[PDB]
Amino acid sequence: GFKGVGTYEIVPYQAPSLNLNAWEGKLEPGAVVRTYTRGDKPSDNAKWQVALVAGSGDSAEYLIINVHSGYFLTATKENHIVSTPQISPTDPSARWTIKPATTHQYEVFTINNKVSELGQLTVKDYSTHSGADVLSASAKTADNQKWYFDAK
């Protein structure tokens, strides 16, 4: 479950054998983000430090920081793949609110950009297989916009 700041796998609701993965797991900035197979031991490029930067409660604003690279999960354009560029911690495109979206008692959450037009973290075309683009897309709390936070 999501219990605030900590290190997590971020796991798509429709495909819980997958997690949120900084593609290629390199140290250079600007990686795109996709779903990928979790594996028995998740790799550091697929772990994320949720770090509080403003507020408290459901309105709290967080950076979602890649464990391997230290770069921040960022939305760059509506209905477009998200990435981990080098970017200021005060840039709202790199800040996210995490909101309960419990579904049949599954403790899942939406991940909502501080720039409201950039919307929610979204698995492209509702894919249930490894390697799907993760988008910032218009917020609807569809099933492909829901996520588990598995504490690590």
Ligand X SMILES: CC(=O)N[C@@H]1[C@@H](O[C@@H]2O[C@H](CO)[C@H](O)[C@H](O)[C@H]2O)[C@@H](O)[C@@H](CO)O[C@H]1O
User: Which residues does the annotation place in the binding site?
Assistant: 21-24, 45
Closer residue to its own copies in complex, CB, 79/86: 86
Q: Which is nearer to its own copies, 68 or 99 (CB)?
A: 68
Closest Cα to residue 48, out of 23, 28, 73, 27? 73
Instruction: Specify the stretch interacting with its own copies by CB under 8 A; choose among 1-9, 101-109, 111-119, 139-147.
Output: 1-9
Neighbours of 119 (CB within 10 A): 21
Pair 30, 47: CB distance under 8 Å:
no
Site string for its own copies, 54-83 (x = CB under 8 A): x--------x-x-xxxxxx-----------
Sign of the torsion angle spanned by Cα atoms 152, 49, 141, 101: positive
* Residue 118 binding its own copies, by CB under 8 A: no
Binding partner selected for residue 26 from its own copies, ligand X, none, CB under the kind-specific 5 to 8 Å limit: ligand X
Q: Helix (H, G, I), strand (E, B), or coil: what is residue 57? A: helix
* Contact call for residue 52 and its own copies (CB under 8 A): yes
Q: Do residues 60 and 66 touch, judged by C-beta distance below 8 A? A: no
130: left (phi over 0), alpha (psi -120 to 50) or beta: beta
Residue 6 in tokens: 């900590």
Partner from its own copies, ligand X, none contacting 101, C-beta within 5 to 8 A by type: none
Contact set with its own copies (CB under 8 A): 5-7, 27, 44, 49, 51-54, 63, 65, 67-72, 86-90
